[PDB]
């Protein structure tokens, strides 16, 4: 009773929250006449999250049904490849947005040419193109496979240990483990630069009672929350993937844990719009 | 046409008190911030005091701070400036100046050699007789 | 579809767009500063020291700084001041030694800070002629209390960082002037733009470094505002 | 020293009495029975992009197709409104340009600013590149506005309180106008070209004779600085804009203010004004990031051109009246029709 | 000093006061007649159909 | 009985 009722509920809540947040952000950005590089990055991230969440139910429903796939063969491959492409696009968008933010905040004069609106749009388009072509292996192996008891499943045509190891390493690295060091380094560098500037400017700010530079943590809170949400949403899934790399005949508890990690994998795509709407620096007035 | 006329002034013994008024016409007195400009002989224009649109914000220059009382009368479109306990160094010409634009907290042309929104001014002389 | 003349016009427009983008990128890596102040403030000496409408170019850490001294117009600044609505910062020089001329400098700073067209532009304040102020304070002839009836009820804050070797009176007067300027600056703005007070002795070679640091901080705040981080 | 002041006051009182004596009827009362224009709706037909800085001035050509724009980034761009193409991109020595003009024949373009110099550029050189024909110097203040009389004569207004007539082939002020009190900001050439009127910061507008060189008529009805002025198509009237959020119509033959265009909710300043081909509609730029179209006969707002997110600095209507261009500090020019 | 400027100012005032300065009614009538005579040929006042205006879109 | 690999199942490896 609990398994078939309570657990599916969170999927719907996450899907609805992500849909509403992404739609609101996209509408606000498109409607707004003034669009800047941060706005372009936020809109691209919102679109990627919207597409990623839209495809989520088509894959999650298989787990809820117990393994049965109802959308047929070709749709299985289509949905799997598009979901992997959306994952890659979201990861790349996060990484490039963090890099651009670091360059803008820490090194304003170092990379002016590539931070232009025109080149920003071109970089986003190239990022989407790269993400789409990085999912080509998924098209090859994503197939519907029959299993005992006659259920059958949206599965991969990977059985040898070497091939599954290669695929798991490629997917996990490109999605979470290559982006994460870059994002963390960018955040730490931004924090250190802000702290250094705060300390250096004390001479021209501490003479008389005035604004104490608004401290350093509060004005970097959004990036920290982004990093925390990304970690909490991706790490469990990507660590369970590595754990499953050495595993035969998975147990019921491991299956439930894997399903929960899959459900939690889409949490960031829905949290991020709330981060940009509520936690942002009074961005609601642009609605 | 915007014109300003100053009434009052004259010869006053040191330490005395005199009251002068500025007449404003041709513009909405309430909506325009008003200022007083003084020009001592042999010296350039200097700022004395200013009056807010509603009179909430009142400020004075350091030289005469705590000595001159200034009031506003939007109904009569006139500006009042009460001066008491004068000093010989206060002998100068008081110019009734208006801010260039209305509903603005900033006024750059308050102290200008060829300002257009100022009156002719009245000469006040402080000396012992 | 299109004619030869139309294709030529389109190609010319594309070339012009490319050249305009190149020029915009060239200008993007340059900071524009507006220099203004009273006649006795000492702008000319500061710019001469930095380089060793009147335009002065100096480069710090391979960053181009373009400072403009209008210094070519009537006494009225009502209109032409609007041309500098998008400058990186405004450098304001005040001769703290002249107590008589200090009130007009404060009024000018009030006008600049509260200008509707300069609300988003930070101001870099240089209190020039510090040696002259120090010797005037250690004279006993002219008292600041005569001009400002508040210096008597003033004490040096414990947060002050005086240079090695200085009398309490000199630092107290300097920080009283800084308090006046900072109170003027913080009376309005809501934190959108910041004032960066500094001390200049008319011979210091660190003015360029301080301008560079202030511009870095201003650009950091602007980027934080753009990215909705602050 | 004081008798002349009393004489001037008496003359001003006599002028006021003469003006009020011949004011039997008001324009609004006469135009009471005229049907309202309605609600004019205009859409952004063309959007011009490429300027890297705020726009300060623009001017349409006599062909109603090519327009020149001036930006504080040092580039003077001639646009092709029909096809949205950039015909020329002229580099400027001074990046503080604040005015520009297009010659009636289209052969020359003039611009200037804080440099106190009006530079004339030739658009029809032999080898083909745009080059400076002559730069006009002599003003002791920033160049505020300029307008060509022909390929050789250009009228100039500067912040030095004086307007001048220049001979391009010579480079000297043929005639100097020194009747203003300070900071003449804009001027408008009459259709006949024999007269022009300029507005200054002393809240007054003065009518000048190009050939005689003396002031023939003065107007004092504003409360703040005047920065916008345009001649009525008939040539017997003109409208002015100031920082009072009011546009006022003055008639040369009446020496009086016919009407004032203002609203309670408008408190921002006015940057530019311009009439339509027939003069029925008066379009005035405002600092509230949008432009509103007024009715020159009933002083009633007809429509709002909200298409800019920054201060609107310049606005101009084509000679044929097909479209009106609006410039803003957001580095975008929008064509409305 | 101002003596040379006051004379010029009063002369300018006298010259300005020696003009016709006709009634406002005639000027208003002339303006109304001019506006009505050109109402048809004012694209802004009367929008043109989408077949002659170059700014089609 | 089914293995898991990237949001979808995998055939179990035996021996």
A217: nearest Cα among A191, A189, A196: A191
CA D42, D46, D52, D55 dihedral sign is: negative
Whether residue A238 contacts residue A175, with contact meaning beta carbons closer than 8 Å, is answered with: yes
Q: What does the alpha-carbon distance between residue C65 and residue D257 come to, in Å, rounded to a whole number?
A: 50
Whether residue D202 contacts residue B116, with contact meaning beta carbons closer than 8 Å, is answered with: yes
Which residues in chain A have Cβ-Cβ distances shorter than 8 Å to D305?
none
> How would CATH label the architecture of B3-99?
Sandwich (2.60)
Token code pair at residue D294 = 């007024």
Contacts of residues A235-242 at CB distance under 8 Å and 24 or more positions apart, as own/partner, are A235/A176, A236/A260, A236/A261, A236/A264, A237/A261, A237/A262, A237/A264, A237/A265, A238/A172, A238/A175, A238/A176, A238/A177, A241/A168, A241/A171, A241/A172, A241/F5, A241/F6, A242/A168, A242/A172
CB contact under 8 A, D22 and E13: no
What kind of experiment solved this structure? cryo-EM
Question: Ramachandran region of residue D74, left (φ > 0), alpha (ψ -120 to 50) or beta?
Answer: left
Whether residue D217 contacts residue D255, with contact meaning beta carbons closer than 8 Å, is answered with: yes
Q: How far is D113 from chain A (nearest CA, A)?
A: 28
Token code pair at residue C122 = 């930070």
Looking up tokens 């450098």, which residue turns up? C91
A223: CB partners within 8 A, 6+ apart: A98, A101, A187, A190, C229
Does B16 lie at the interface with D, CB-CB under 8 angstroms?
no
C57: CB partners within 8 A, 6+ apart: C51, C64, C65, C66, C67
Radius of gyration of chain B from its Cα atoms, rounded to whole angstroms: 14
D195: CB partners within 8 A, 6+ apart: D207, D208, D209, D210, D216, D235, D252
To which H or E segment does residue E8 belong?
Answer: helix E2-16
Nearest to B107 among C111, C147, C148 (CB): C111
Q: What does the alpha-carbon distance between residue B86 and residue C100 come to, in Å, rounded to a whole number?
A: 19
Buried b (16+ CB within 10 A) or exposed e, D251-286: bbbbbbbbbebbeeebbbbbbbbbbbbbbbbbbbbb
Does C23 lie at the interface with D, CB-CB under 8 angstroms?
yes
Q: How far is D51 from chain C (nearest CA, A)?
A: 8
C172: CB partners within 8 A, 6+ apart: C154, C155, C156
Token code pair at residue D262 = 């203002």
Which residues in chain D have Cβ-Cβ distances shorter than 8 Å to A34?
309, 330
Q: What does the alpha-carbon distance between residue A77 and residue A86 come to, in Å, rounded to a whole number?
A: 14
CB contact under 8 A, A159 and F5: no
Whether residue D322 contacts residue E53, with contact meaning beta carbons closer than 8 Å, is answered with: yes
CB contact under 8 A, C104 and B46: yes
Whether residue C105 contacts residue C38, with contact meaning beta carbons closer than 8 Å, is answered with: yes
Q: How far is C17 from chain D (nearest CA, A)?
A: 7
Whether residue D230 contacts residue D239, with contact meaning beta carbons closer than 8 Å, is answered with: yes
Interface of D with C in 181-220 (CB under 8 A): 182-183, 185, 201
The torsion defined by the Cα of C206, C207, C213 and C214, in degrees rounded to 10, comes to: 160
The total number of residues written for chain D in this structure: 337
Whether residue A84 contacts residue A138, with contact meaning beta carbons closer than 8 Å, is answered with: yes
To which H or E segment does residue C145 belong?
Answer: helix C144-147
CB contact under 8 A, C78 and D114: no
Buried b (16+ CB within 10 A) or exposed e, D62-100: eebbbbbbbbbbbbbbbbbbbeebbbbbbebebbbbbbb
B39: CB partners within 8 A, 6+ apart: B45, B46, B92, B93, B95, B121
Whether residue D307 contacts residue D334, with contact meaning beta carbons closer than 8 Å, is answered with: yes
Measured CA distances, A231 to A17, A267, B71 (Å): 19, 11, 65
C85: CB partners within 8 A, 6+ apart: C117, C118, C121, D54, D329
Buried b (16+ CB within 10 A) or exposed e, A191-218: bebbeebbeebeebbebbeeeebeeeee
Q: What does the alpha-carbon distance between residue C133 and residue C200 come to, in Å, rounded to a whole number?
A: 11
Q: Where are the domains of chain A?
A: 2-200+211-286
Token code pair at residue C58 = 């100096």
Which residues in chain D have Cβ-Cβ distances shorter than 8 Å to B2?
203, 220, 223
Q: How far is C190 from chain B (nearest CA, A)?
A: 14
Which residues in chain D have Cβ-Cβ distances shorter than 8 Å to C10?
85
Q: Do chains C and E touch (3 or more CB pairs under 8 A)?
A: no
Cα angle D299, D301, D304; round to 5: 150
CB contact under 8 A, D114 and C10: no
Whether residue E13 contacts residue D255, with contact meaning beta carbons closer than 8 Å, is answered with: no
CB contact under 8 A, C76 and B105: no
To which H or E segment does residue E4 belong?
Answer: helix E2-16
The torsion defined by the Cα of D197, D200, D205 and D211, in degrees rounded to 10, comes to: -30
Q: Which of A159, A252, A264 to mutate to test the interface with F (most CBs of F within 10 A)?
A: A159
Which residues in chain B have Cβ-Cβ distances shorter than 8 Å to D269?
101
Looking up tokens 């870059």, which residue turns up? A182
Which residues in chain B have Cβ-Cβ distances shorter than 8 Å to C147?
62-63
Assigned CATH topology for domain A2-200+211-286: Rhopdopsin 7-helix transmembrane proteins (1.20.1070)
**What is the DSSP track for C5-62?**
HHHHHHHHHHHHHHHHHHHHHHHHTEEEEEEEE-TTS-HHHHHHHHH--EEEEEEETT
Measured CA distances, D234 to A2, A73, D188, D237 (Å): 85, 77, 13, 7
The residues with which B68 forms a beta bridge, in sequence order, are: B83
Q: How far is B5 from chain C (nearest CA, A)?
A: 23
Residue A249: CB atoms within 10 Å: 11
Does F15 lie at the interface with A, CB-CB under 8 angstroms?
no
Measured CA distances, B87 to B83, B127, C104, C154 (Å): 10, 8, 21, 26
Question: Ramachandran region of residue D245, left (φ > 0), alpha (ψ -120 to 50) or beta?
Answer: left
**What is the DSSP track for D21-36?**
HT-SS-HHHHTTSSPP
CB contact under 8 A, E45 and D276: yes
A53: nearest Cα among A24, A82, A77, A96: A82
Cα angle A170, A171, A175; round to 5: 115
Q: How far is A44 from chain F (nearest CA, A)?
A: 24
Token code pair at residue A174 = 């490109």
Does B88 lie at the interface with D, CB-CB under 8 angstroms?
no
The resolution in Å comes to 2.4
Query: End-to-end distance of chain B based on CA atoms, in angstroms?
Result: 41
Token code pair at residue D55 = 């726009």
Does F2 lie at the interface with A, CB-CB under 8 angstroms?
yes
**Checking DSSP bridges between strand C89-95 and strand C30-37, what pairing results, if any?**
parallel
Q: Which of D85, D87, D94, D180 to mutate to test the interface with C (most CBs of C within 10 A)?
A: D85
Token code pair at residue B9 = 């002034």
To which H or E segment does residue C174 belong?
Answer: helix C168-186
Q: How far is F5 from chain A (nearest CA, A)?
A: 7
What ranges make up the beta strands (E) of chain C?
30-37, 54-60, 63-69, 89-95, 122-128, 195-199
Residue D200: CB atoms within 10 Å: 28
Which residues does B contribute to its contact with C (CB < 8 Å)? 46-47, 61-63, 65-66, 100, 104-115
Residue C212: CB atoms within 10 Å: 18
C170: nearest Cα among C159, C180, C162: C162
DSSP one-letter code for C139: T
The residues with which B25 forms a beta bridge, in sequence order, are: B3
Q: Which of D321, D325, D333 to mutate to test the interface with E (most CBs of E within 10 A)?
A: D321
Pick the residue from chain D with its C-alpha nearest to A34. Answer: D309
Q: How far is D304 from chain A (nearest CA, A)?
A: 17
C115: CB partners within 8 A, 6+ apart: B106, B108, C81
The residues with which D249 forms a beta bridge, in sequence order, are: D239, D259
Q: Do chains E and B touch (3 or more CB pairs under 8 A)?
A: no
The torsion defined by the Cα of C70, C74, C80 and C85, in degrees rounded to 10, comes to: 50
Q: How far is A25 from chain D (nearest CA, A)?
A: 20
Q: Do chains C and F touch (3 or more CB pairs under 8 A)?
A: no
Sketch out chain E's domains with CATH numbers: 3-55 (4.10.260.10)
Pick the residue from chain A with its C-alpha nearest to C156. Answer: A207
Residue D244: CB atoms within 10 Å: 26
Q: Which CATH superfamily is domain D33-336 in?
A: YVTN repeat-like/Quinoprotein amine dehydrogenase (2.130.10.10)
DSSP one-letter code for D107: S
D252: CB partners within 8 A, 6+ apart: D195, D207, D217, D236, D237, D238
Cα angle C95, C96, C102; round to 5: 85
D118: nearest Cα among D164, D68, D55: D164
For D62, the 3-state DSSP assignment is: coil
Nearest to A258 among F1, F4, F12 (CB): F4
C75: nearest Cα among C113, C38, C118, C117: C38
Q: What does the alpha-carbon distance between residue D139 and residue D162 come to, in Å, rounded to a whole number?
A: 8
Residue A239: CB atoms within 10 Å: 14
To which H or E segment does residue D189 belong?
Answer: strand D184-189
A147: nearest Cα among F2, B114, D43: F2
Q: Exposed, middle or buried by CB within 10 Å (0-12, 13-18, 19+), for C117?
A: middle
**Phi then psi for E17, rounded to 5 degrees?**
-85, -5
Q: How far is A144 from chain F (nearest CA, A)?
A: 10
Q: What does the alpha-carbon distance between residue C106 and residue B5 come to, in Å, rounded to a whole number?
A: 28
SS3 of chain A? CHHHHHHHHHHHHHHHHHHHHHHHHHHHHHHCCCCCHHHHHHHHHHHHHHHHHHCHHHHHHHHHHCCCCCCCHHHHHHHHHHHHHHHHHHHHHHHHHHHHHHHHHHCCCCCCHHHCHHHHHHHHHHHHHHHHHCCHHHHHHEEEECCHHHCCEEEECCCCHHHHHHHHHHHHHHHHHCHHHHHHHHHHHHHHHHHHHHHHHHHHCCCCCCCCCCCCCHHHHHHHHHHHHHHHHHHHHHHHHHHHHCCCCCCHHHHHHHHHHHHHHCHHHHHHHHHHHHHCCCCHHHC
Token code pair at residue D310 = 């920054």
Q: What does the alpha-carbon distance between residue D104 and residue C211 come to, in Å, rounded to a whole number?
A: 47
Question: Ramachandran region of residue D203, left (φ > 0), alpha (ψ -120 to 50) or beta?
Answer: left
The torsion defined by the Cα of C169, C174, C175 and C179, in degrees rounded to 10, comes to: 130
A40: nearest Cα among A101, A102, A124: A124
Sketch out chain C's domains with CATH numbers: 4-227 (3.40.50.300)
Interface of C with D in 145-204 (CB under 8 A): none
In what order do the strands lie in the sheet containing D66-71?
Answer: D55-60, D66-71, D75-80, D85-91
Q: Exposed, middle or buried by CB within 10 Å (0-12, 13-18, 19+), for D6?
A: exposed
Looking up tokens 């850490």, which residue turns up? C61
D199: CB partners within 8 A, 6+ apart: D184, D185, D186, D187, D205, D226, D227, D228, D229, D240, D241, D242
Nearest to C103 among B61, B66, B107 (CB): B61
**What is the DSSP track for D264-315?**
TT--S-EEEEEE-SSSSEEEEEESSS-EEEEETTT--EEEEE---SS-EEEE
Whether residue C65 contacts residue C215, with contact meaning beta carbons closer than 8 Å, is answered with: yes
Query: End-to-end distance of chain A based on CA atoms, in angstroms?
Result: 42
Token code pair at residue A122 = 């071109």
Q: Which of A36, A45, A108, A281 to mutate to test the interface with C (most CBs of C within 10 A)?
A: A108
Token code pair at residue E20 = 């016709």
**What is the DSSP track for D217-274?**
EEE---SS-EEEEEE-TTSSEEEEEETTS-EEEEETTTTEEEEEE--TT--S-EEEEE
For C183, the 3-state DSSP assignment is: helix
Count Cβ–Cβ pairs < 8 Å, chain A vs chain F.
64
Nearest to C83 among D98, D183, D185 (CB): D98
D110: CB partners within 8 A, 6+ apart: D100, D101, D103, D118, D119, D120, D121, D146, D148, D154
């Amino acid at each position: 009773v609990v398994d078939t009722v309570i657990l599916p509920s969170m999927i719907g809540i996450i899907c609805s929250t992500g849909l509403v947040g992404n739609i609101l952000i996209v509408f606000t950005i498109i409607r707004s006449r003034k669009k800047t590089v941060p706005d372009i990055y936020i809109c691209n991230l919102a679109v990627a999250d919207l597409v990623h969440i839209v495809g989520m139910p088509f894959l999650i429903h298989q787990w809820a049904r117990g393994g049965e796939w109802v959308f047929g063969g070709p749709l299985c491959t289509i949905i799997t490849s598009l979901d992997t492409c959306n994952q890659f696009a979201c990861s790349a968008i996060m990484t490039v947005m963090s890099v651009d933010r670091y360059f803008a905040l820490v090194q304003p004069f170092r990379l002016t040419r590539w931070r232009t609106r025109y080149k920003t749009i071109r970089i986003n388009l190239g990022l989407w193109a790269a993400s789409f072509i990085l999912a080509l292996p998924v098209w090859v192996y994503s197939k519907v496979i029959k299993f005992k008891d006659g259920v059958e499943s949206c599965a991969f045509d990977l059985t040898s240990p070497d091939d599954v190891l290669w695929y798991t390493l490629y997917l996990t690295i490109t999605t979470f483990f290559f982006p994460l060091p870059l994002i963390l380094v960018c955040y730490i560098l931004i924090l250190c630069y802000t702290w250094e500037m705060y300390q250096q400017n004390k001479d021209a700010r501490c003479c008389n009672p005035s604004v104490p530079k608004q401290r350093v943590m509060k004005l970097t809170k959004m990036v920290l929350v982004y990093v925390v949400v990304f970690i909490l949403s991706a790490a469990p899934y990507h660590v369970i993937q590595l754990v499953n790399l050495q595993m035969e005949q998975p147990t019921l508890a491991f299956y439930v844990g894997y399903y929960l990690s899959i459900c939690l994998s889409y949490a960031s795509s829905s949290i991020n719009p709330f981060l940009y709407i509520l936690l942002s620096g009074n961005f609601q007035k642009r609605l | 046409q915007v014109q300003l006329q100053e009434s009052g002034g004259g010869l006053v013994q040191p330490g005395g008190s005199l009251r002068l008024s500025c007449a404003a016409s041709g513009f909405t007195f309430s909506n325009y911030k008003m200022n007083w400009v003084r020009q001592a002989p042999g010296k350039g224009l200097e700022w004395v005091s200013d009056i807010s649109q509603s009179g909430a914000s009142i400020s004075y220059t350091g030289s005469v701070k705590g000595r001159f009382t200034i009031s506003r009368d939007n109904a009569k479109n006139t500006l009042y400036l009460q001066m008491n306990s004068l000093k010989p160094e206060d002998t100068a010409v008081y110019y009734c100046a208006r801010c260039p634009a209305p509903f603005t907290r900033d006024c750059f042309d308050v102290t200008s050699t060829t300002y257009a929104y100022r009156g002719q001014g009245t000469q006040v002389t402080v000396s012992s007789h | 579809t299109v004619s030869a003349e139309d294709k030529a016009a389109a190609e010319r427009s594309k070339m012009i767009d490319k050249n305009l983008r190149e020029d915009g990128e060239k200008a993007r890596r340059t900071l524009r500063l507006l220099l203004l102040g009273a006649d006795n403030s000492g702008k000319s000496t500061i710019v001469k020291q930095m380089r060793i409408i009147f335009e002065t170019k100096f480069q710090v850490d391979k960053v181009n700084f373009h400072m403009f001294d209008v210094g070519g117009q009537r006494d009225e600044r009502r209109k032409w001041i609007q041309c500098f609505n998008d400058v990186t910062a405004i450098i304001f020089v005040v001769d703290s030694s002249d107590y008589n001329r200090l009130q007009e400098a404060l009024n000018d700073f009030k006008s600049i800070w509260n200008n509707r067209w300069l609300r988003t532009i930070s101001v870099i304040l240089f209190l020039n002629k510090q040696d002259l102020l120090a010797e005037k304070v250690l004279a006993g002839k002219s008292k600041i209390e005569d001009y400002f009836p508040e210096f008597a009820r003033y004490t040096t804050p414990e947060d002050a960082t005086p240079e090695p070797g200085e009398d309490p009176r000199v630092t107290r007067a300097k920080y009283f002037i800084r308090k006046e300027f900072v109170d003027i600056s913080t009376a309005s703005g809501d934190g959108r733009h910041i004032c960066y007070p500094h001390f200049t002795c008319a011979v210091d070679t660190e003015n360029a470094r301080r301008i560079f640091n202030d511009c870095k901080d201003i650009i950091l705040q602007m980027n934080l505002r753009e990215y909705n981080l602050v | 020293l004081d008798q002349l002041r009393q004489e001037a006051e008496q003359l001003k009182n006599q002028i006021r009495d003469a003006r009020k004596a011949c004011a039997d009827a008001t324009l609004s009362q006469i135009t009471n029975n005229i049907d309202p224009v309605g609600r004019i709706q205009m859409r952004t037909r063309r959007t011009l992009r490429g300027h890297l800085a705020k726009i300060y001035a623009m001017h349409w050509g006599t062909d109603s197709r090519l327009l020149v724009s001036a930006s504080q980034d040092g580039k003077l761009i001639i646009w092709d409104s029909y096809t949205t193409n950039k015909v020329h991109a002229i580099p400027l020595r001074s990046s503080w340009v604040m005015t520009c003009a297009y010659a009636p024949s289209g052969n020359y373009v003039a611009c200037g600013g804080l440099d106190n110099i009006c530079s004339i550029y030739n658009l029809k050189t032999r080898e083909g590149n745009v080059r400076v024909s002559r730069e006009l110097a002599g003003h002791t203040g920033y160049l505020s506005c300029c307008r060509f009389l022909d390929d050789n004569q250009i009228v100039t207004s500067s912040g030095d309180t004086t307007c001048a007539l220049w001979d391009i082939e010579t480079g000297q002020q043929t005639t100097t106008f020194t009747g203003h009190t300070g900071d003449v900001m804009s001027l408008s050439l009459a259709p006949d070209t024999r007269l022009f009127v300029s507005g200054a910061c002393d809240a007054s507008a003065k009518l000048w004779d190009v050939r005689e060189g003396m002031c023939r008529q003065t107007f004092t009805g504003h409360e703040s600085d005047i920065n916008a002025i345009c001649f009525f198509p008939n040539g017997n009237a003109f409208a002015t804009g100031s920082d009072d959020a009011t546009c006022r119509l003055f008639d040369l033959r009446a020496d009086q203010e016919l009407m004032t265009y203002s609203h309670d909710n408008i408190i921002c300043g006015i940057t530019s004004v311009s009439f339509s081909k027939s003069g029925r509609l008066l379009l005035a730029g405002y600092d509230d990031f949008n432009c509103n179209v007024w009715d020159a006969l009933k002083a009633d707002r007809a429509g709002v051109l909200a298409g800019h997110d920054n201060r609107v600095s310049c606005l101009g209507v084509t000679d044929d009246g097909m479209a009106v261009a609006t410039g803003s500090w957001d580095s975008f020019l929008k064509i409305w029709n | 000093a101002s003596i040379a400027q006051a004379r010029k100012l009063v002369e300018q005032l006298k010259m300005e006061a020696n003009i016709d300065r006709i009634k406002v009614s005639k000027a208003a009538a002339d303006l109304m007649a001019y506006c009505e005579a050109h109402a048809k040929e004012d694209p802004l006042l009367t929008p043109v159909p989408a077949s002659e205006n170059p700014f089609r879109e | 009985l089914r293995c898991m690999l990237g949001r979808v199942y995998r055939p179990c490896w035996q021996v």
